[PDB]
């Protein structure tokens, strides 16, 4: 059944594109980054001042594709580390 049961497409997370990911630089403020990329939909609420941008799509009958961006900020709001995981392990 799983081969033919029609599943409507599922989208999750923010929308990312290489044209914008390449625009983020160390030294930018949180306001500059949010402006360039948009308000993030995920963050770590448990103290750490970090934001997550997860681009996830599951087309029906096709599979899961995910581009993961992680932004770590210090106590002053200065970006310290840019992660990039173009695919899941």
């Amino acid at each position: 059944l799983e081969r033919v049961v029609y599943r409507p497409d599922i989208n999750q997370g923010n929308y990312l594109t290489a044209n914008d990911v390449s625009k983020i630089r160390v030294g930018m403020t949180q306001q500059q980054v949010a402006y360039a990329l948009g308000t993030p939909l995920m963050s770590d609420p448990f103290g750490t001042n970090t934001w997550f941008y997860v681009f996830r799509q599951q087309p029906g009958h096709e599979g899961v594709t995910q581009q993961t961006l992680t932004l770590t900020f210090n106590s002053s709001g200065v970006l310290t580390n840019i992660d990039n995981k173009p695919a899941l392990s």
């Binding site: 059944l1 049961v5 029609y6 989208n11 999750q12 997370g13 923010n14 929308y15 948009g38 308000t39």
Partner: protein
């Protein structure tokens, strides 16, 4: 309104333009503004870039004996479009903008086409996620060549995300019921096409009177939206029972329940039955539209009956699942017990029984026959209707059938097809036209005939209005051993009252049927909102026919030929369908135009609806 006078209008005459005016009387209450804008569009849609209404007057006659309406019109020339240049903060979608923007050179200037272009741009951007774009079009009028150049200022804004989806008004249905019909997921971009499908989907279930939507801006951030749906639940299902006593029946009772939504959990169930001195009936039906998250469905039913002669009971379970947003498949299994006794000799019945291998004596009613068959059923459906109970558009197709499997006693097939199409008549859906057809055919396999108890019947509001239920079709022919009802029996059945084989009025059903009708659905402005809002009426023409396959018209040379499919019956009339708060009710009045001997008519009919 003594007259309307147009001053200085040479392109068109008064009647041509007045035919579009609605204020054609007293107390117009300034409704004229609607007509003046219509006049502007008429000219603005025809290239008159300089059309302008300069003044209007309304004059009263002495003592308010009449009204004089005059409009001063200034006309211009006809302008053609020269081209369109679009610039601004476009999010790379240059090909789609060029494709929708592009016009045919020389095309007459049309303000409406410009507005349509703006709407297409907004819809495109909404599809990508630009929920609130700004598009500003303006003409450039070149008097030197009678052309208009267009410029559009497009501002896509930015992408929006949906933070939360909330529902209000779902006091009885389980919250899970509404979330299953959304295609927009939280934590994802707001493609505008996905929200509208959700709005439409909640009206497909048929559990609500209305569906409203909103896209409210989140006060804490310029890029997030909260989507809220509001529904008003209506009564879904009823419970009935009854009982009585008297000398004509002793004691009898009936009861049952049916709901499309069981206690708000999404399950569709119903139970009914009855018992009397001659007939027993029971039915149980349970189905789950969402067995699995993706909407695999399961259900089935049990039944038992008898009659004081035959007896039957059986069971079936059906599985089904979608295969795209508008199509689904169903299949299942079941079992039916069929035991006959004290069968009245009939030609059709005995030909069937002889083919089955039975050898009853001529006119011997002291008999019985019983088999236990296993069968397989299947079907296919399509449903793109835009409403639950009063469709306004779309169509529905229901193709079903069942077959026997090895080990059974009977060998047969049956196929039926139910279709209907709704097409709006009016721009505002005041008038609607409804087409309906039904078709079916079946027969036996391997030289056997279909059991007589599976034949098709027609008549009643479910097929052809105006005829008695299950009366359209060929009638029974009875054989002339013994009967103690001669003193209480059929003339063709009694061995003493008749000595030959002859026809009676008892319908036996057929192997094929055809039903069709056309209905013109009219508004009811003469009925107040309290009732009119839940009732529609229509004018219609009904036709159909039932006939017998494997009819030996050669042997029965003195009787009509039941194999002739051309003896089409036709009728027409007016029907009313009212979605009563206590369960939709239907009735109609219709008269026959073409009838054959035995076609008993019922010009006025009433029944409980809840069908279609």
């Amino acid at each position: 309104i003594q007259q309307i006078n147009i001053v200085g209008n040479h392109a068109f005459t008064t009647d041509e333009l007045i035919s579009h005016f609605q204020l054609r009387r007293k107390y117009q209450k300034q409704k004229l503004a609607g007509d003046l804008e219509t006049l502007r569009s008429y000219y603005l849609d025809r290239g008159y870039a300089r059309f302008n209404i300069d003044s209007t007057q309304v004059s009263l006659t002495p003592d308010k004996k009449g009204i004089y309406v005059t409009v001063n019109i200034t006309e211009g020339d006809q302008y053609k479009l020269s081209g369109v240049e679009v610039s601004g903060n476009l999010a790379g979608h240059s090909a789609e903008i060029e494709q929708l923007t592009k016009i045919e050179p020389g095309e007459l200037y049309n303000g409406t086409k410009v507005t349509k272009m703006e709407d297409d741009i907004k819809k495109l951007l909404g599809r990508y996620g630009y929920a609130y774009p700004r598009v500003q079009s303006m003409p450039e009028i070149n008097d030197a060549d009678k052309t208009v150049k267009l410029r559009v200022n497009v501002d896509a804004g930015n992408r929006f995300y949906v933070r939360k989806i909330r529902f209000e008004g779902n006091d009885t249905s389980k919250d899970a019921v509404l979330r299953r019909e959304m295609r927009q997921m939280e934590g994802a971009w707001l493609g505008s096409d996905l929200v509208d499908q959700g709005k439409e989907r909640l009206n497909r279930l048929g559990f609500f009177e209305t569906v409203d939507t909103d896209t409210q801006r989140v006060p804490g951030s310029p890029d997030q939206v909260d989507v809220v749906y509001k529904v008003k639940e209506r009564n879904t299902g009823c419970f009935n029972f009854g009982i009585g006593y008297g000398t004509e029946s002793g004691v009898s009772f009936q009861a049952g329940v049916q709901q499309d939504n069981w206690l708000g959990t999404g399950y569709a169930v119903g139970i009914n039955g009855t018992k009397n001195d001659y007939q027993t009936y029971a039915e149980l039906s349970v189905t789950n539209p969402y067995f699995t998250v993706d909407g695999v469905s399961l259900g089935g039913r049990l039944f038992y009956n008898d009659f004081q002669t035959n007896k039957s009971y059986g069971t079936d379970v059906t599985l089904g699942f979608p295969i795209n947003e508008y199509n689904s498949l169903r299949a299942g299994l079941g079992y039916v017990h069929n035991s006959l006794s004290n069968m009245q000799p009939q030609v059709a019945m005995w030909r069937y029984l002889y083919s089955m291998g039975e050898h009853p004596s001529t006119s011997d009613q002291d008999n019985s026959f019983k088999t236990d068959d296993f069968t397989f059923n299947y079907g296919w459906t399509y449903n793109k209707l835009d409403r639950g109970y009063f469709p306004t558009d779309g169509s529905r197709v229901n193709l079903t059938g069942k077959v026997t499997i090895p080990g059974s006693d009977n060998e047969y097939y049956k196929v039926t097809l139910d279709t209907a199409t709704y097409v709006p008549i009016d721009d505002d859906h005041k008038w609607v036209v409804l087409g309906r057809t039904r078709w079916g055919y079946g027969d036996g396999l391997g030289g056997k005939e279909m059991p007589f108890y599976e034949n098709f019947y027609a008549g009643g509001s479910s097929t052809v209005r105006g005829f008695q239920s299950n009366t359209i079709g060929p009638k029974a022919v009875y054989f002339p051993q013994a009967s103690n009802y001669d003193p209480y029996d059929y003339e063709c059945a009694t061995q003493d009252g008749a000595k030959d084989l002859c026809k009676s009025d008892d319908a036996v059903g057929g192997n094929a049927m055809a039903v069709a009708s056309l209905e013109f659905i009219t508004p009811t402005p003469f009925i107040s909102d309290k009732y009119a809002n839940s009732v529609r009426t229509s004018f219609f023409w009904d036709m159909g026919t039932v006939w017998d396959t494997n009819w030996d018209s050669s042997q029965y040379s003195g009787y009509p030929d039941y194999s002739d499919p051309s003896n089409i019956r036709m009728s027409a009339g007016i029907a009313l369908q009212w979605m009563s708060p206590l369960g939709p009710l239907v009735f109609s009045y219709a008269q026959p135009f073409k009838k054959y001997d035995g076609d008993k008519a019922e010009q006025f009919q009433f029944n409980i609806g809840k069908t279609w």
